[PDB]
UniProtKB/Swiss-Prot annotation:
Protein's name according to its UniProt entry: Myoglobin
Lineage of producing organism: Eukaryota, Metazoa, Chordata, Craniata, Vertebrata
UniProt-listed PANTHER family: MYOGLOBIN (PTHR47132:SF1)
Residue ranges constituting the Globin domain according to the UniProt record: 1-147
Chain sites annotated for binding O2: 64
Record carries keyword Iron: yes
Keyword Transferase annotated: no
Family annotation (Pfam families): Globin (PF00042)
Top-level EC class as recorded in UniProt: oxidoreductase
InterPro entries, A to Z: Globin (IPR000971), Globin-like_sf (IPR009050), Myoglobin (IPR002335)
UniProt GO BP: oxygen transport; removal of superoxide radicals
Xref: Gene3D superfamilies: 6.10.140.2100, 6.10.140.2110
Subunit and interaction comment: Monomeric.
Family: Belongs to the globin family.
Length: 152
């Protein structure tokens, strides 16, 4: 649950992402894959990537980064009223991709890391607080659907 002022911070930060969605999406996935190499094994189309240089050179990884952040941005713009947008993603990630909630924690922290890396000194403590709360809400509502499905 976020206040109006917190949502305003989230959507202000998101403007930074929308200026370069592919570059942000690429770096988020690279941070996930290099920090948590077990996550790469869930992607049949990226498991061939052995080095970060190959990851950086992969145009399909940048494409998928655009898909991921476009979906997340659509959810964030609903300011919590995201049941219709979130349900299909919860279902596909639990039942088809088999993504444990832990990996959603990993990618949430990766987003925070990338924002500081690309905007050092321009991602203030209030903005980090609000973005963190928004990603916690996203993860918590996914977790509720995971529990319904019995997925661990
Ligand atoms: C912010 C969190 C995430 C968002 C918004 C997101 C979004 C998406 C979307 C929109 C798709 C394509 C449609 C679909 O299959 O539902 C997708 C596919 C997929 N996601 Fe995610 N995802 C997220 C996190 C993760 C994480 C953490 C993992 C694994 C560590 C993951 C694994 C996958 C896989 C394996 C696919 C299929 C890729 C393919 O072969 O095309 N997702 N995701």
């Amino acid at each position: 649950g976020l206040s109006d002022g917190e949502w305003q911070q989230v959507l202000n930060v998101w403007g930074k992402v929308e200026a370069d969605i592919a570059g942000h999406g690429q770096e988020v996935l690279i941070r996930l894959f290099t920090g948590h190499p077990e996550t790469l094994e869930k992607f049949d189309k990226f498991k061939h990537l052995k080095t970060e240089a190959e990851m950086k050179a992969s145009e399909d990884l940048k494409k998928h980064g655009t898909v991921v952040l476009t979906a997340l941005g659509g959810i964030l713009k609903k300011k919590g009223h995201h049941e219709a947008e979130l349900k299909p993603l919860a279902q596909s990630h639990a039942t088809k991709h088999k993504i444990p909630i832990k990996y959603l924690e990993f990618i949430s922290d990766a987003i925070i890391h990338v924002l500081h890396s690309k905007h050092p000194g321009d991602f203030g403590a209030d903005a980090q607080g609000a973005m963190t709360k928004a990603l916690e809400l996203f993860r918590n509502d996914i977790a509720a659907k995971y529990k319904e499905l019995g997925f661990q």
